[PDB]
Design a protein around this ligand. Structure first.
Ligand SMILES: O=P(O)(O)O[C@H]1[C@H](OP(=O)(O)O)[C@@H](OP(=O)(O)O)[C@H](OP(=O)(O)O)[C@@H](OP(=O)(O)O)[C@H]1OP(=O)(O)O
Lengths: 231, 231, 231, 231, 231
């Protein structure tokens, strides 16, 4: 038995966190899981932080693969044998309903049953599906909607920034730069009307009125003022 | 067995209520629960008042750690009569399906199984996740939305006040200082138009028409008249 | 032997990377290494990515502590074969010249020798020294010197960016918003006159002459012309 | 023993030279070394031409992995002569202190010790580190410093060209189109005034005085004359 | 054996940290180490924090004294097993190659060998040399060089402040009242023009160009304009 080492698992986690789910994660995984048991592969998968939608898609793909294996490979009545090794099922290959001893026995039996390799193939199918379909979210993509309240936008921005992979200084710089930048024009003009030294609460109070009756009437009157004056 | 004392439990409760879930709770916990059985740790956790979201995240982390323990650690189906002590499961370490005597036996038998230490590590992981992800709400954060009715804002304000950790006089001071200050400009203009001695019912009646047809027509007409008289 | 779990080790790594070496790492380490062997502690220390200066200072502190332990504690001349084990030394406590079985034997023998606890104390002393003395480097701190060539500053910036913990999109935004901003005034004037659409190669070509005879003559002539025109 | 074929090894060398150390080298390496002994992997690594810094980082990563393997895996005191082989160490897995026969015995014995697979994992970790941190040098990146003498820049350019992978005609075209282009403005002015037919010796003679007292005085006088004539 | 008490050792540490290495440390040391073994003397010396240069000079003096003792005192060839002990050497007196039991036996045997007294004399000679030749560094002595970049001076200032023995509030006050004051005139002019409310990053940005072509040209132009206007 050669269980996955802390350095290898950490390298896998850093690869996933640095490349998000770019295609380059597919080779790295295959390179960091050679000879791995299904338990080691499950440890690799469960240690990933974030990307909950991607892991959900991966779990769905693994479940479909296990169901297909169960369909194609029938169960046996289970007669006793001198070796008495039960035939693995989809859950056994996925490691959900099997122990490390059972996986090792299957992998080192004669003839061998490479449950680890089948599970790797399932995980690679899921990873390819993730690469095709999943697009990671970023603090750079958090923009205020045309009618979204400024408080809701600030809450979304801070929720995304809390899960962002960056240092605290970088996160403070992101707050100083992108929050006002990615606001909608109605709130952005008010924010620019305020000084650059305004604290968060002052911006919240300033934009608390955007989309209300008073602000709507004020902007409508300001727009009509130009057309009246030009006439 | 030195169970947790009422003084230590009370001190933990005050630490949680005073520092919300700032990083400072992690040392205090580690200092107030050394040598504690999983039952004592559960008693410490369940005594926390409020912070239901943080408690939910902590429970999710604890369940994840227990599931990972169950996955990695196999369960033997053969009972042994000499030294009859079952191997703890994840829920047994978490104290959900284990008794105090069983936890003491695990913490005392040779070789020791530090169920309390493992549970404490799981709780610390959950607390670190809470510190990273959880932001407690305060009465200072209850602001009226631009399109939110004043009655709904008042209901939210009083619901948050009822859960605020403060004395009654402080709560009345917050009611008299923050309810009008943290309202949207459309309602705040009407509230300032009313006298400072206006009651809650008068304040609600005055703002009952904000966002309605009459109030919107009135503000639009006021803005139009201002810009027309400017010309 | 309750060896450190993959999730605990990964959580330690993320704590170190997220908090750099702020004091908050000290409570986490103590909470994540309770009951750990010197081998486990060395595994936690060796898995830290980056912060080479901090790890060097930690290793120096550990070496001083081991040397002091060796100075205070003398060796024994005659080994006791029956029912006795070798007395640990500084390197044995630090795990450099010790095996996991020997460490477990020391912690399990009566009377116990808490080699893990002594090593934890040494590591905490080193971590406190790091917190006092070490300041991490950031991409935000990379600024062009008054006389530094623009190529050298760009090389330093890109090295720090490659070492930075961030997503690729965030790194691209960092390059787009930090490289020109943190340049010196002599290069910043040319970069701003070049336009926002300029590429990196165009920017380096435009600043290739800053500090050369022609650039110095040109800026001196501009200043002289201004002061003569004022006269 | 399926030793690496000359065509496979040459294809690996061409992959490394063509792609530098882009991520694409990782899938190819794993594809070209599957089933390889540590000796074959060492032959693959040692045949790489150039990229001395990248090979140094790879060797450092391999050394760290071997040291960690030695730390985790203790040695055995008493050798077993009948029907047993020496347990591999970090250097044995890396192939530094191991022979091909011992490697084949390890990957063939029951239970197998996949020394080739472990060494492949270490090399893949090093390659990932290279991909993250290493940027290859190119003749296109050789530029004259603002105060660098033209002779030194020409020497650097010709050294890089000698190290460049290109045909002799292509290298001549690079000399004819890149040396003058990537010179600093002070030298570029003189080179352009010299004419396209100027030889290398003529260009180096013409720029021999850039940065000297006479050249600086002349350029300062030209700028001063321009600004005085404007007045 | 009257080993040095924790209060005595801590008092010695406070004496060194308060008086730096003024002559006053010599009477205190002799008063705080009377009757001490070489081990206690080494514990007193090694616990001193900071003053690395002074400790280096002290160790050099101790090594010189040990070498002179070894030169003057020859070794003995034939050991005397019954009723005799090894004759101390220079390193034995210094405690480097001696154990506490041997030191006590030397200071107790008849005739006594005052290894503690000899080592005290050596340490006193080293301390006298330190008082004569060593001057401690202070945050008050950190000044910007006439040509030193402002960033380098800020880095030196913050390193010295981190190494300074003061409270955090005192360190903040030192930063607020010493950084600008001890800057060179070229940077001080810009810092004063920036205003007292300027932040550290703003101050570094404002002084990023001092010593560059533009700043030199501008100051030369200002001086030239002044003298021309006088004419
Ligand atoms: O606030 P209400 O009195 O109930 O009227 C609203 C309002 O239209 P007006 O302010 O022009 O009267 C909305 O404007 P927004 O707040 O969304 O900007 C509009 O929504 P849209 O202009 O975006 O479509 C919506 O619907 P609609 O104009 O289609 O009628 C309309 O609702 P009602 O007049 O039906 O109540």
């Amino acid at each position: 038995h050669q269980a996955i080492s802390p350095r290898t698992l950490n390298a896998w986690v850093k690869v996933v966190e640095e490349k998000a789910f770019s295609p380059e994660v597919i080779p790295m995984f295959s390179a960091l899981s050679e000879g791995a048991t299904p338990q080691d592969l499950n440890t690799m998968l469960n240690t990933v932080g974030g990307h909950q939608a991607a892991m959900q898609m991966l779990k769905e793909t693994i479940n479909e693969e296990a169901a297909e294996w169960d369909r194609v490979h029938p169960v046996h009545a289970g007669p006793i044998a001198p070796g008495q090794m039960r035939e693995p099922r989809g859950s056994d290959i996925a490691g959900t309903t099997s122990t490390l001893q059972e996986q090792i026995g299957w992998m080192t039996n004669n003839p061998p049953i490479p449950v680890g390799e089948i599970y790797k193939r399932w995980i690679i199918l899921g990873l390819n599906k993730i690469v095709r379909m999943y697009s990671p979210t970023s603090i750079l993509d958090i923009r205020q909607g045309p009618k979204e309240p400024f408080r809701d936008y600030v809450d979304r921005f801070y929720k995304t920034l809390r899960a962002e992979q960056a240092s605290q200084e970088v996160k403070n710089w992101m707050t100083e730069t992108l929050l006002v930048q990615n606001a909608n024009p109605d709130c952005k003009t008010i924010l620019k009307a305020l000084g650059p030294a305004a604290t968060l609460e002052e911006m919240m109070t300033a934009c608390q009125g955007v989309g209300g009756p008073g602000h709507k009437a004020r902007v409508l009157a300001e727009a009509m003022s130009q057309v009246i004056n030009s006439a």
